[PDB]
Amino acid sequence: KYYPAYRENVPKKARKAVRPTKLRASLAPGTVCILLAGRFRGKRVVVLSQLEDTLVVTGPYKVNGVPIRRVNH
Amino acid sequence: QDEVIWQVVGHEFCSYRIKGEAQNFCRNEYNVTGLCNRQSCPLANSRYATVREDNGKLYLYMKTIERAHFPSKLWQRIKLSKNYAKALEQIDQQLLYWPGRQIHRCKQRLTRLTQYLLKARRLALKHQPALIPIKPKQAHREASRERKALIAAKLEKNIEKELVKRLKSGVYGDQPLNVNEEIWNKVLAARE
Amino acid sequence: VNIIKKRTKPFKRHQSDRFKRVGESWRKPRGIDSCVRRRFRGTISMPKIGYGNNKKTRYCMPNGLKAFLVRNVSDVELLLMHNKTYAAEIAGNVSARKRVEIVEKARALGVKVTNAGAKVRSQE
Amino acid sequence: GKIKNKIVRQQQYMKALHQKNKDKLERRKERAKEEEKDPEKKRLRLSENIPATIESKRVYDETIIEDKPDEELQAELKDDEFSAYFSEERKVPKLLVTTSKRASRKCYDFASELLDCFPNAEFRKRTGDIEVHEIAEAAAKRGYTDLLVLNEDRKKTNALTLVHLPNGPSFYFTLSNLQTAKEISNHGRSTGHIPELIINNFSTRLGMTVARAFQSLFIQTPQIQGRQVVTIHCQRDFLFFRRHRYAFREKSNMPDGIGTGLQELGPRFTMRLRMVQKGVWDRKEGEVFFESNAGEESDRRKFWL
Amino acid sequence: VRYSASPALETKCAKARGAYLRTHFKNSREVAFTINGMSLKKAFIFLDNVKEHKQAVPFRRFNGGVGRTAQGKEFGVTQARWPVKSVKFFYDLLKNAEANAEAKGLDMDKLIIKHVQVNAAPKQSSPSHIEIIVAEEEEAVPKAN
Amino acid sequence: MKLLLGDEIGQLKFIEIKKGTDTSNPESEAPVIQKFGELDREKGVLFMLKHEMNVFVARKNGTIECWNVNQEPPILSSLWQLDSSLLETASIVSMKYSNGWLMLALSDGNLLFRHIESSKLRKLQLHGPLSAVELHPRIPGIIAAGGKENDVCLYSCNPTCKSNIDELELWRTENVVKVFQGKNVKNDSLNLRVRVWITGIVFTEDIIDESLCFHFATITHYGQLRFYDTKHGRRPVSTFDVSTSPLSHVGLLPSIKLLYFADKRAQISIFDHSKKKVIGRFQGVKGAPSSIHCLGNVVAITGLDRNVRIFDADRKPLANAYIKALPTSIIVINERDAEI
Amino acid sequence: MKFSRDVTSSRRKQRKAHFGAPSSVRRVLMSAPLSKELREQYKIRSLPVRRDDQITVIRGSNKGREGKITSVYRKKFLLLIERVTREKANGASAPVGIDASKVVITKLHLDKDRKDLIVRKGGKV
RNA sequence: AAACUUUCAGCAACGGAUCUCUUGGCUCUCGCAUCGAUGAAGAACGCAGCGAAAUGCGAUACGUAAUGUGAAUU
RNA sequence: UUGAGAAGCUCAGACGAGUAGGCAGGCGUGGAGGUUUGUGACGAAGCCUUGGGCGUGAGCCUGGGUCGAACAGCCUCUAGUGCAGAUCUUGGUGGAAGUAGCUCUA
RNA sequence: GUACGUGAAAUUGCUGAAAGGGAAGCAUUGGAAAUCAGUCUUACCUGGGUGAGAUCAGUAGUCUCUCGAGACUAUGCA
């Protein structure tokens, strides 16, 4: 079952490399930020740290009830 | 031979050819690809190799130009092992110093024929509904007989007749709950 | 190479809706004064070679396969090496007995059938 | 026939047809005069000349159950597969309605109507590759007693196999004329009351088995106040399933002076008994109690149910 | 035989036909329109009145050349006529349909004209096919739940 | 034609059907039926082996009895019983008479042989699940048993014995050794194992170590008729996929010296060993047959259609009758007509 | 294949000859096969049907029915058999015609002419 | 709104296309040579079955005799 | 690297109105020779359909309905071979109109 | 159902839905309503256990082809 049974149009070597996301200078860790979409739209939450593209964000769960969540920048 | 054969069968008339919108096909049994091509033709290639399935076993069929005039002895076959790795080795060793295009095509057909045998075995173990053909004459008859049966049934007349009959027989308690005062009083005066 | 259609509407013959005697099969207008032949504004389009579709995706069904007409079990077995490129289409005049045999064979070959449910019932 | 001229042969037909009508009219007019003069002659003609019907000229079969009670028939039933329902035990029937694999919403719109018809019935969507016998043996441990599988293909329910649990008889019907409440003129809304059951015209012995099977799907005690009745009527081997809401009223035509009015609730459909099997349904390895032959059904006057 | 209407199921209906009748198609069409939907007893009274010129049949679609009358004010139109050939055929067909219902055992005091249609017979003048279906008035059973 | 019939509710019917009778025909003569026995479901009949002019009746509750059908009406000549500890988890699957001994095998492999004269019994354990077991009609002390996932094996009491063996010393557990064990056929063309479920066994040497070469045929739950010849090998000599439904009964027709079989799909056909094909079917049978008995030229079939159908060796519908209650077994007593 | 130019293979002419034959030709056109016992005893494969012949129906809905030939309806190429009928609306039994090729003769209505005919077609009486 | 008008769909009419059929036509080829005063071709009138707006026949009137075939005619 | 229907495969660039007229390639119909170890009473052909799909198009495939005995793909041969018009031919059927006629009328 | 195989279009009636005010039908784009189409996770890989069988036997025979190539028949399942 292993030998290719068809033309096997193997994709050409694509010269695309993964590089780190350049987030905005204003999305530093610790800055208060307003959520725009999702079930928690309109809430204000604190940016703990930046993931590769998203921001690991949370409002103090005793304050606005927004748990440890990810948010797209 | 081969070039004259191709100029006749390939471009004038072949009984094995199926003309298609994008590509012609070959209903020949010994065609590796199933397409009408110059390299795919078993008629126009005197050195040909194919893989065919015989009652659950795969065989490598080969013919050489030196047996072209003897149709009964033209094709020779070897049994290909059930181990896929060894089946590839047997194709390699039986087709030694053949063009790599022909070994490539036999190895591709071996894969597809091995897959088809796998899927066939998996369908046997599985349970699938039987396909019941629809018979036009039976459908017409039962459609017209049903219409006559429904008319002859008199459903609402028989439903009402039975409901009243069991009302008179008092299948309910002393006084019914499905009737009102006037109906019950009328029934009591009639049935008694 | 996903399937792209340059146009999905058909080309209807001019004045075919006005007259029942005039069919909608396309006919090239020959009148010199006719505005459709002159290709004015607002008039109906005409078959041009620019409307032709990609050669690679030509004849391909929306699922990427090409319909291959099948009349018996011999035709289905032909698509053993082309089950990723072609779909079996049983002919309209093949009886319900042969349709069943075709459909079981196509299932083992891994061949898509366009009309595999025609003229048959199911019973599990 | 003899005339191969189209115009002449239909001229001859019109001439003969007019001649036939005249003599029939003359015989009828003279028969009316004599029967008027002597009313006894009219009594004799009416009594002797009863119009024929397919029911009257139905072919004779000895399997028909007589109205006189039979001790052999009752001895068979008292320890039958449905005995737990018709005895003093009074096993409450629990239904499990399912469909075929990968069914469309058209099947659910009819299944919901079938769910309304039967209270204490449960619907479970068919998942994966579980078979009917596996469902039956699994449902037999969940307290269910009857399993209903609706076979549909191309967005149309066309068959229904009902299996008596745990190892009772299996019946297979092919459905037709499936109509829902919205499609029925002057329909109604069905409440939660337990419907009454009417079973008619199941004369043959094979009819008793099918009539018992359909009877076993209903709660033994109906709610009379709901005034809902479910009818399964067998006519010329066609079983018609109707559900109506009735109200007794006064009808002048009826001899008793009383007659109910009906308002359909749905669903309405027709069934043909294709096969009865001993035990859980298995189209391949099952034991055929009864299998319908379409060649024998060609006789208009031959019935099995 | 099959009629234009899905009703005429045996239980609560009765049918009557007349084919190749020697009467005008347009006059019969107008009479059919008027008596459609009426109760059977009411329709018989109305047809008798048209015979006696007490009531007028309002020619409605083929009203060209038809003189208006005050007796059409009931129907909301103006043009009206008093055909007697069309009425006689419709009265006979209604008598047949009533007799058919009596044989069927239908309730005779609830019969209404559910479907009456007039179709053009082959040109022999313009003859007319007429078919009538009278069905019981379907009442609603109270839920009481 | 005199014939006895048992039913699922234990009642015994003694029918006097005659050639040309068909209860479906309103002009036919009604058969004379003399019913006797029990009218209870728990005492339903299972098997009706015929011992010369006597009839042995097996019942669901284990009340094996014998009837003398020479006299009319038959009277209970003898009665036996089976321990309830042998029936709480097992069921009688076969019961036959040979050399004065009554085979009474169960579903779990327990064998209950029984001498009619000395009234002695001996237990005999066997292999696992059992669905068919038959004794050799001619050679004494030979058994052939098989079941679900239990390939057919031959058990022999006397090794050779060279002429015959006494009746009293049969069936001893210390003398029975298996002289043949079936070998399963090779895997299917899809490399799938051919499952084993034996549902019937018959010895076909009459229609084909002294007295070796046991020729016999078996029928399986997967509708394949297998002919075995122990001299040839443990594998079946021939295998025919004669039906797509499980096969219920198998036997020989001595009138034509030929074999018959029936399946659960209400189909009884005749298999020609010499021609290696099925020749004709016993047409007109509805509902799965429950028992078939052949006596000379007369073969009687009863089934789930609640009818008794009489055919000849050439599949001609000699007689037919309706028996109201669901039957379980059939037996042909007298092949000749009633007036004979 | 036919080689004589005195026989026509034209469908137009063969159909015209069959459907416009006189009664003498129609007598031979409606012939029936003899039963196996009569075939080996009279050394004849088939014979024209005659009244009072005892036949068995081989094909059709009435397959298996036996009876005498009550009348040979030559104008329609049909045979009328005793008690092989069909019920009508008014109760009168309308006879059913069976083609002569669909029946087999089990007993011959032997006369002097038939015996001479038998020995004429190489047949021992 | 209703009516009317218009559009679409279902059913029912009307009509007789399409398809399939075909004891007909058309065309070619082959063999043959035979009307009448011993009353021809044609026309008319009858006969008996009929459906004749057809056929057969001639007061011996569906023909009679003879040679057949051999049990129907319908 | 398999991509030799060499009549195939592949790479590149430019261009695209069109009457008369010229030149290629195709679609469809009746019949014929060959072929598909072709389709068909478990339903051929035709017809219907707001079912689905393919082709720039001529057209083709298909589901459902209806229906009841034949029919098609490919290679070649053949021709009485494709319609919206001809104040076209034959047949069928409309609006005028229940009008002219023989207040309302029958 | 003899107004008789199939039963097209033009045309007509009834019913259902929708739109209505005069160039209109029509073309382009979407909405709404109605309806329809196909696309499914299921297999693949890997490990062990249990049995199985041959294209495996430190195995015995037959048949057909050209030593060995196919087909089988016994026997064992490492």
Swiss-Prot record, chain A:
Transmembrane portions of the chain: none
Cleavable signal peptide: none
Single GO cellular component term: cytosol
GO BP of this protein: cytoplasmic translation; ribosome biogenesis
Keyword tRNA processing belongs to the record: no
Subcellular localization, as worded in the UniProt entry: Cytoplasm; Nucleus; Nucleus, Nucleolus
Keyword Acyltransferase tagged: no
Keywords of this entry: Cytoplasm, Nucleus, Phosphoprotein, Ribonucleoprotein, Ribosomal protein
GO molecular function, one term: RNA binding
Similarity comment: Belongs to the eukaryotic ribosomal protein eL6 family.
Biological role: Component of the ribosome, a large ribonucleoprotein complex responsible for the synthesis of proteins in the cell. The small ribosomal subunit (SSU) binds messenger RNAs (mRNAs) and translates the encoded message by selecting cognate aminoacyl-transfer RNA (tRNA) molecules. The large subunit (LSU) contains the ribosomal catalytic site termed the peptidyl transferase center (PTC), which catalyzes the formation of peptide bonds, thereby polymerizing the amino acids delivered by tRNAs into a polypeptide chain.
Subunit structure, interactors included: Component of the large ribosomal subunit (LSU). Mature yeast ribosomes consist of a small (40S) and a large (60S) subunit. The 40S small subunit contains 1 molecule of ribosomal RNA (18S rRNA) and at least 33 different proteins. The large 60S subunit contains 3 rRNA molecules (25S, 5.8S and 5S rRNA) and at least 46 different proteins.
The protein's name: Large ribosomal subunit protein eL6
Organism of this sequence: Schizosaccharomyces pombe (strain 972 / ATCC 24843) (Fission yeast)
Span within the parent record: 26 to 98 of 195
From Swiss-Prot, chain B:
Cellular compartments annotated: Cytoplasm; Nucleus
Similarity section: Belongs to the MAK16 family.
Domain of life assignment: Eukaryota
Record GO biological process: assembly of large subunit precursor of preribosome; maturation of 5.8S rRNA; maturation of LSU-rRNA
UniProt motif (Nuclear localization signal) ranges: 136-141
Keywords, comma-separated and alphabetical: Cell cycle, Cytoplasm, Nucleus
Full-protein positions shown: 3 to 194 of 302
Protein name, per record: Protein mak16
Organism this protein belongs to: Schizosaccharomyces pombe (strain 972 / ATCC 24843) (Fission yeast)
One GO term describing the cellular component: preribosome
From Swiss-Prot, chain D:
GO terms under cellular component: nucleolus; nucleus; preribosome; preribosome, large subunit precursor; sno(s)RNA-containing ribonucleoprotein complex
Pfam families in UniProt: Brix
GO BP, sorted A to Z: assembly of large subunit precursor of preribosome; cytosolic large ribosomal subunit assembly; maturation of 5.8S rRNA; maturation of 5.8S rRNA from tricistronic rRNA transcript (SSU-rRNA, 5.8S rRNA, LSU-rRNA); maturation of LSU-rRNA; maturation of LSU-rRNA from tricistronic rRNA transcript (SSU-rRNA, 5.8S rRNA, LSU-rRNA)
Brix domain segment(s): 93-282
Domain of life of the source: Eukaryota
Disulfide bridges in this chain: none
SUPFAM superfamilies given in the database record: Class II aaRS ABD-related
Comp. bias (Basic and acidic residues): 20-41
Any GO molecular function: rRNA primary transcript binding
Region (Disordered): 15-48
Alphabetized PANTHER family for the sequence: RIBOSOME PRODUCTION FACTOR 1, U3 SMALL NUCLEOLAR RIBONUCLEOPROTEIN PROTEIN IMP4
Designated name of the protein: Brix domain-containing protein C4F8.04
Organism: Schizosaccharomyces pombe (strain 972 / ATCC 24843) (Fission yeast)
Lineage, broadest ranks: Eukaryota, Fungi, Dikarya, Ascomycota, Taphrinomycotina
Curated annotation (Swiss-Prot), chain G:
Listed GO MF terms: RNA binding; structural constituent of ribosome
Region Disordered, residue ranges: 1-23
GO BP: cytoplasmic translation; ribosomal large subunit biogenesis
Subcellular compartments: Cytoplasm; Nucleus; Nucleus, Nucleolus
Origin: domain of life: Eukaryota
Keywords in alphabetical order: Cytoplasm, Nucleus, Ribonucleoprotein, Ribosomal protein
PROSITE patterns: RIBOSOMAL_L24
Gene Ontology CC entries for this record: cytosol; cytosolic large ribosomal subunit; nucleolus; nucleus; preribosome
Pfam families according to UniProt: KOW (PF00467), Ribosomal_L26 (PF16906)
Subunit field text: Component of the large ribosomal subunit (LSU). Mature yeast ribosomes consist of a small (40S) and a large (60S) subunit. The 40S small subunit contains 1 molecule of ribosomal RNA (18S rRNA) and at least 33 different proteins. The large 60S subunit contains 3 rRNA molecules (25S, 5.8S and 5S rRNA) and at least 46 different proteins.
Entry's family note: Belongs to the universal ribosomal protein uL24 family.
Reported function: Component of the ribosome, a large ribonucleoprotein complex responsible for the synthesis of proteins in the cell. The small ribosomal subunit (SSU) binds messenger RNAs (mRNAs) and translates the encoded message by selecting cognate aminoacyl-transfer RNA (tRNA) molecules. The large subunit (LSU) contains the ribosomal catalytic site termed the peptidyl transferase center (PTC), which catalyzes the formation of peptide bonds, thereby polymerizing the amino acids delivered by tRNAs into a polypeptide chain.
Gene (name only): rpl26
